[PDB]
């Protein structure tokens, strides 16, 4: 079985990420924090809410990736850097959920796997990947047959139009169909729009309450329609899949990794 | 009650002519153009439900004492001549026309004043009682929630948002008290910021074949509550027309809407 | 403002409650507890998480019950009964949405609401006391001109189906239709049924992963049809319902109430 | 361009399969009725409703087939038997979508599509067909991790449940995912149910108006939901489909295929 260790495993998304841990069935093999923490000592499992399991938070990533074959790291881009280098040097494969690094953290980033497999995704959902795929799978067979919207919900505390995931669907569908996306897309329809292009692709943003998030594609044809939906209950299901992507990357060729591959989707 | 079909050569006669059967009521007569070709066909052969032994005639006055309500869904200047005559002959008509000029439609309301008559601006059943609905929910829910309009429409339709949505959000706005106008928002794109509660958000989709859905979202905190009219073909205001015209026979001659014959105004 | 005071403010339900109270701008009266609770003398402001209000936790509700114009308690039905008593003698109105109550425990809140007002609901989720009033208007409209057929979704964990919910929502039709729910309900489909008989009101029970709960009613007609939907995100929209029944019932007359007098359905 | 006969060209598929080449563009090489049929010597076009195309209804089949490069057969199974001896002498490739086929009258297409090119398939819709592939593709990567349901909408008079499109969703999906079906689906709930099993394939079946067709596969995980659906506006989206495989075949070895095919689902 893997050994996956969680780092910055005091915060929110750490605790989320060890119970996923426990929930696959994997060894927790770390919990890491900052070396000034106040939880440095708590049971890894008890702070998670899954009740102890005997792995204790340390402050010292270097102490313990020998008890590792991969690390989560889900913190800031600083920190990322600092977790880069000392996975390189003891060959732990890490896998990285940080946002917003710099180009210079990136290309970091890109050096370090040269030497050590490294998991890099935009979003480790296992569901929203898959939408993705469906997506580009359907806009291939339907071409230029159907009409092509669009629609997402949000709360109304989100303040960009449309989100991003809905934007790397649209990305996604035009980059299949040879579109430009810039050229293609509107986002709202008010008076004589006139009749549908075909080429448009409609983005239709939904804004109200505490809906957590859901992205609908509706391929719309001459007398049938196709759907392919995503929704999400809770901002948890980044774990399950980056767990998967951990146990996933553990032995593997030192190459840059996305959830693509782990998902075996780029076939 | 014995119901006529005023313009029963068209797409629309025809359905209505299949209304009034599928209701189970006696067909009265079937009106066309006084020039149209198929006066003396019968009108259940040419609706595609076997003879009924009625036949089309071009001459709506010999057969008004045929009928006890007429149904007219032409254009408005073979209404005005429609409504005159069944004035005179004491016989109610539904008035479905769309358009109606604003001298004749002020004739209507003087011809009420004489004989019972239905005007709507929509005759779809579950249209109107959607609205009830909106209204209804709206009215308790309040400022509580935030309210989008989500309708969908084939790639040929022109107008955005549909009649039947702006008609929904103008039910709505006037629930709340809002004006429609100030607080719409037709498309979302960039840094929008939050929400501000009082808006009321269009959402319009537009492909295909789709006839026409509507969804209303009264989106609270931790949960929501939608309102969907769907529609599978163009074919539903007849049997609301049909509904109509059955409900209006025999009533005290004012101007009614669907909002009477569905029993709207009596729960608020 | 009224003052409203929250009964088993250390559990789950108390908690969420007490940020009801305090997010509709109503000042807390009082936060009882199990008489054996640690928690008493914390405050319940800062225990609920929405930082110190003032008010701490105290073990007798006797003792509170001059702060307080209402009272809500979401707790057993034996400590409702000693609830039950202890109100009427105050004078304080009671919200009472605890489940499972005995057909002598239900008696005994009845002849509690001729002395002091009463509000008991099955569901105090406003929208979903909505959407109930919504289907009893659209099947007075519609009549045997539509199909009628209850979806619902829930978790995987959930033991029973159709849930109490769509039960409710297919009761409130059955009798608007004057139909009787044993005899016209189906909770499945296979193999040759045959057409669909006007009268039958079917079940579609979906179960499956973590979904909190999702109830659809479809008015299937000619040509044409209308949805009804709630959909519930978390467990805690019975709280606001609560907190509005709480403040609507003060100061009235002695009756039992539910949320369709609070809602104004009626 | 293709030479595209339609076969039964008076029936309401018929009629529909003509509206579907004029929309294709492609050339309507022939329009074949019963030699007896009073709709011998009128326009295709015209009885179609898409006004005069040139082309008018003949009896012969033997005839026309020089005019074709492919022929489109709704009819009946002792009919399609004929005409796949005539395309087979002729050399002209055939679509088939003939219901009820004998396992013999079936042995005798695996025969002639060793001599001519025929496309068999249960569902000539692009959208269903693209739909199950989606099915495919989403079960494999979720695997054990959701709870699979289906749920299907038809009109109040459909006599079967589930429909037999959600049963060959089902299908796939058991299939992929090595279940068997038969094992693991349920049709109803109702009372004291018990807890889900993750094995367990539901349909809910949904009965009532005049309801064309849906049909709804919800993948169901933890903190998520991903669904594919597809919805019929009305009976007509095989024709696209059939035409789309008419043109698809032509000019191709002399092989049994199907909308997996056509639609380049294999891989």
Redesign the interface.
Known sequence: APRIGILGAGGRMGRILIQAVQQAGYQLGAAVVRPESTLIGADAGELAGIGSIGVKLTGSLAEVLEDCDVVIDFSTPAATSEHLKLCREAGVAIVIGTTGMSDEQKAELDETAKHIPVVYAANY????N??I??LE??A???GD?????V?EAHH???????SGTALMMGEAIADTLGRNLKEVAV??????????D?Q?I???????????GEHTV?????????????????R??FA?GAVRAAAWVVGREARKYDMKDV???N?
């Open positions: 959902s296992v569901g929203v898959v939408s795929k469906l799978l359907a291939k067979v339907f047959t159907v009409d092509i919207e629609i109304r505390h989100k303040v960009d139009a449309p986002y709202g329809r008010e008076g004589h729009t006139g009749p549908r075909r448009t409609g983005f239709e943003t939904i804004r109200g309450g505490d809906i957590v509706m391929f719309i044809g001459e007398g049938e329609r196709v759907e392919v939906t995503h929704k999400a209950t809770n948890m299901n399950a998902l075996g989707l076939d």
